[PDB]
Amino acid sequence: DELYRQSLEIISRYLREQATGAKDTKPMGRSGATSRKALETLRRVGDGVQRNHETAFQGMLRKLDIKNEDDVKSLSRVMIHVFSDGVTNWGRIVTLISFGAFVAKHLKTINQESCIEPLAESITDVLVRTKRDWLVKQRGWDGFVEFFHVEDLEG
Ligand SMILES: CN1CC/C=C/[C@H](OCCN2CC(F)(F)C2)[C@@H]2CC[C@H]2CN2C[C@@]3(CCCc4cc(Cl)ccc43)COc3ccc(cc32)[C@@](O)(C(=O)NS(=O)(=O)N(C)C)CC1=O
Numbered sequence: 001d002e003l004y005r006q007s008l009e010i011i012s013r014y015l016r017e018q019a020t021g022a023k024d025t026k027p028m029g030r031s032g033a034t035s036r037k038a039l040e041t042l043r044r045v046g047d048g049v050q051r052n053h054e055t056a057f058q059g060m061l062r063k064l065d066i067k068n069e070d071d072v073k074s075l076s077r078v079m080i081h082v083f084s085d086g087v088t089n090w091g092r093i094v095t096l097i098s099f100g101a102f103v104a105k106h107l108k109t110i111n112q113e114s115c116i117e118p119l120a121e122s123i124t125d126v127l128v129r130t131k132r133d134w135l136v137k138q139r140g141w142d143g144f145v146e147f148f149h150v151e152d153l154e155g
Contacts, residue, residue, distance in 0.1 A: 001128075002030060002031070003128060003132070003135060003136070003140055004124065004128045005029065005030065006029075006030065006031055006034075006035055006140070006141055007124045007127060007128050007141070008120065008121065008124045009028060009029055009035055010035055010038045010039055010042065010141065011097060011100070011120050011123055011124050011127075012117060012120040012121075012124075013039055014039060014042045014043070014046065014097065014100075014101055015100055015101050015104040015116055015119065015120045015123075016104070016116060016117075016120075017039075017043075018046075018101035018104055018105055019101075019104040019105050019107065019108040019113065019116055020108070031141070034141050034142050034145060035141065037145045038141045038144055038145055041144065041145055041148045042094070042097060044148070045094050045098075045148055046094055046097060046098040046101060047098075049094055049095055049098040050098050050099075050101065050102055053095075057099060057102050060099070061102065061103065061106060064078070064103075066103065066106060066107070066110075067110070067112075068112065068115075069112075069115055069118075072107070072112075072115045072118060072119055072122075073118075073122075075103070075119070075122060076122045076125065076126060079096065079122070079123065079126040080126060080130065083095075083096045083126060083127075083130075084126060084130040084131070088131055088134045090138075090144060090147050090148070093127065093131075093144075096123060096126070096127060097123060097127075100119060100120070100123045103119060104116045104119060104120075107119070
């Protein structure tokens with residue numbers, strides 16, 4: 001399952017990078033060039049979403065009351081409720097992943113770093129396993145990179 005593997009790698013790296021503040025130096029697996037550009041895109045676009053919606057992000061986190069492994073496990077049900085049961089577009093996918101990074105940073109601050117990788121698997125599961133058809137039709141991560149591509153300015 002190339003799409004799942006690639007999705008997991010991108011999502012995991014972003015969540016880990018966000019939580020630790022350090023870049024992972026290990027090579028990407030398959031389709032490395034696209035995965036690199038996807039991660040760079042998430043860095044640009046996800047960071048903005050977290051700031052543009054700072055108050056709501058803090059509010060949702062407080063509402064979820066995330067303390068440990070059991071609470072982190074319960075998030076899949078909530079992701080299905082909120083994300084899967086709605087329209088699909090790249091903006092909503094970025095918000096899914098960006099709030100994931102927001103949760104990962106919370107896990108770091110409460111010294112629950114070990115829950116970050118399971119969280120990343122949970123997000124990947126919801127995204128790929130409920131929206132595969134849409135993702136394929138939109139050209140997957142290549143489509144993601146193309147969608148958010150910014151032209152160089154003249155002059
Ligand atoms: C306009 N926006 C961004 C702003 C919305 C912020 C939202 O808060 C609204 C105000 N609430 C927070 C409160 F304090 F409880 C009062 C939530 C902050 C995270 C937003 C909820 N989640 C986050 C969520 C759901 C919660 C659990 C979760 C966990 C992980 Cl690890 C990752 C993602 C998620 C599913 O992913 C989302 C995808 C798309 C949208 C919203 C998603 C959205 O696509 C979406 O559908 N949001 S919404 O259902 O709440 N509604 C505003 C349309 C995001 C969107 O439209």
